[PDB]
Design a binder for these strands. Structure first.
Ligand SMILES: [Mg+2]
Length: 216
DNA sequence: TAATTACCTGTGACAAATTGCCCTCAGACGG
DNA sequence: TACCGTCTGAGGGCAATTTGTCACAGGTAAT
């Protein structure tokens, strides 16, 4: 089939800002970690390239820039507690191979109240906020492949660390919500719809229902 | 009744970031 | 054992799209 990512809901719902490339590598880190405690993971350019249909060159570029873009990035678990992703710079012992040092204090948060999806399910998504949304929906996914969940807008904004102009709702709709629904519906197997929940003039939650394209 | 205010909404416009894409050239390796 | 061609990937760039930010116009209700 394809690699099965599983992760604690606390990571699905953590507050952080990562790019697509960084989240993709992070999925591979979570897989390596799950196999076995040292916090040391490894990524091969050619393996990354084959997984995500990239060139060796563009794989190398994506890995390198994601990796140097991790510096200063932080992850927040709201039970809040903030951690750095990396506790040592990445480095390449051999050409085409990178070794990275994830904060070992993060190990128990990566590994019964959990979220799971196959990597082929997410590897064509481009917008990182749409990967965050697809992970949050997976957290509520039933065996058959459908689910329903109400997410609060403030919680969406804080958890996905959406940029400030998306606190203006028409921009939230236009540049995040609609784009990620279209992206998920066109690039994943999940078939996603939504409806808006209001309180007075303000929209407070977004209600997601979804099904799997193995059904009608 | 009318005008101003305090909310919301959508879209046009621009800036900034991100995309897959292109070209160069050395390291590793095997032939 | 030694040289060179090939594949790899570590770099430099790119224009076309996507994303992020804001001015502006319209609607409504409170006042
Ligand atoms: Mg790239």
């Amino acid at each position: 089939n394809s690699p099965r990512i599983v992760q604690s809901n606390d990571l699905t719902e953590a507050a952080y800002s990562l790019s697509r490339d960084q989240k993709r590598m992070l999925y591979l880190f979570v897989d390596q970690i799950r196999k076995s405690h040292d916090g040391i993971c490894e990524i091969h350019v050619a393996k990354y390239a084959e997984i995500f249909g990239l060139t060796s060159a563009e794989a190398s570029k994506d890995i390198r820039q994601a990796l140097k873009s991790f510096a200063g990035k932080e992850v927040v678990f709201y039970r809040y507690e903030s951690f750095p992703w990396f506790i040592k710079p990445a480095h390449s012992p051999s050409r085409g191979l990178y070794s990275v040092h994830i904060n070992p204090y993060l190990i128990p948060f990566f590994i019964n109240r959990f979220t799971q999806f196959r990597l082929s399910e997410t590897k064509e998504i481009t917008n990182p906020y749409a990967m965050r949304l697809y992970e949050s929906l997976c957290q509520y996914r039933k065996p058959d492949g459908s689910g329903i969940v109400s997410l609060k807008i403030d919680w969406i904004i804080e958890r996905y660390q959406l940029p400030q102009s998306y606190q203006r709702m028409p921009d939230f709709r236009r540049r995040f919500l609609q784009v990620c629904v279209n992206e998920i519906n066109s690039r994943t197997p999940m078939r996603l719809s939504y409806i808006e929940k209001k309180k007075g003039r303000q929209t407070t939650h977004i209600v997601f229902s979804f099904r799997d394209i193995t059904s009608m």
